[PDB]
Design a protein around this ligand. Structure first.
Ligand SMILES: COC(=O)c1c(O)cc(O)c(Cl)c1CCC(=O)Nc1cc(O)c(OC)cc1O
Length: 213
C-alpha cells in the first residue's frame, strides 16, 4: 500500500512551469543532481565524525550514474545520508520552500533557468528532461522507501519491496522524455560532468553496458 500526499501549492506551480519550458540548456539538471548528491554525502561524512558507525552501512562514499536505455531511464545514485519516510514527505513536497515563488518570479523577469540551484530548488530541474521520477532512499534510521512524482499535484511514498537494496543513500530514477534520450549516452554524460562538475570531492562512477566482442 502506498500513501498519497499533495505538494505545497507553489511546488506544483514550479514543476508545471519547468516540465513545459522551452529552455535550451537542459543539461544543467545533471549538475544540480550531482550537487545534491555531494551535499548528502557531505552530511553523512560530517555526521560520521562523532559517530563513525554511521558509515558501516555503506563504507564507500560515491556518486554513480547508471543509464538504462531499454527503459529510457537514467539513475543518479549516492551513498550519502539518505532520507527516512518522514524526510521524503517533508523535503520533497509538503513543506513550503523559501525560493519556489522567488525563483519563479525571477524566471518571469528573464532569469536563466540555470539559477534554479541558487534558489534552493534545483531538484526540480529534473523535470527539464524527465516527466516522471522515483526517489529511492535508505537512511540508517528507517526502511527503504520510494517517493514518486509525475509533476502532478500529488506524489506517493511506498515501502520499497521491489528495488535493489541500497546500503545507505539515495537513487534518483529519472524516466526521460522521448526527446532527451541523449543523456543515456556515455559520451554526452561525460561532457556534461566535466563541464559543470569539475570540483566534486567524491568519485563519480559511470556504469556502461557493452556487448562482448
Ligand atoms: C539528504 O538529501 C538527500 O539524501 C538527497 C540526495 O541524496 C540526492 C538528491 O538529488 C536529493 Cl534532492 C536529496 C534531498 C535533498 C533535500 O531536499 N534535502 C533537504 C531538504 C529540506 O527541505 C530540508 O529541510 C527540512 C533538509 C534537507 O536535507
Amino acid at each position: 500500500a502506498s500513501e498519497t500526499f499533495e505538494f505545497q501549492a507553489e511546488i506544483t506551480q514550479l514543476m508545471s512551469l519547468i516540465i513545459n519550458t522551452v529552455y535550451s540548456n537542459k543539461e544543467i539538471f545533471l549538475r544540480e543532481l550531482i550537487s545534491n548528491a555531494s551535499d548528502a554525502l557531505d552530511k553523512i561524512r560530517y555526521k560520521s565524525l562523532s559517530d563513525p558507525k554511521q558509515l558501516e552501512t555503506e563504507p564507500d562514499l560515491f556518486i554513480r550514474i547508471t543509464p538504462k536505455p531499454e527503459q529510457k531511464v537514467l539513475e543518479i545514485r549516492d551513498s550519502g545520508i539518505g532520507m527516512t519516510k518522514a524526510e521524503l514527505i517533508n523535503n520533497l513536497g509538503t513543506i513550503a520552500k523559501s525560493g519556489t515563488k522567488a525563483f519563479m518570479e525571477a524566471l518571469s523577469a528573464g532569469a536563466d533557468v540555470s539559477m534554479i540551484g541558487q534558489f534552493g530548488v534545483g531538484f526540480y530541474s529534473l523535470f527539464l528532461v524527465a516527466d516522471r521520477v522515483q526517489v529511492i532512499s535508505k537512511s540508517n534510521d528507517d526502511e527503504q522507501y520510494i517517493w514518486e512524482s509525475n509533476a502532478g499535484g500529488s506524489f506517493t511514498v511506498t515501502l520499497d519491496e521491489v528495488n535493489e537494496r541500497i546500503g545507505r543513500g539515495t537513487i534518483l530514477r529519472l524516466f526521460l522524455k522521448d526527446d532527451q534520450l541523449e543523456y543515456l549516452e556515455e559520451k554526452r554524460i561525460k561532457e556534461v560532468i566535466k563541464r559543470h562538475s569539475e570540483f566534486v570531492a567524491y568519485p563519480i562512477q559511470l556504469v556502461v553496458t557493452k556487448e562482448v566482442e
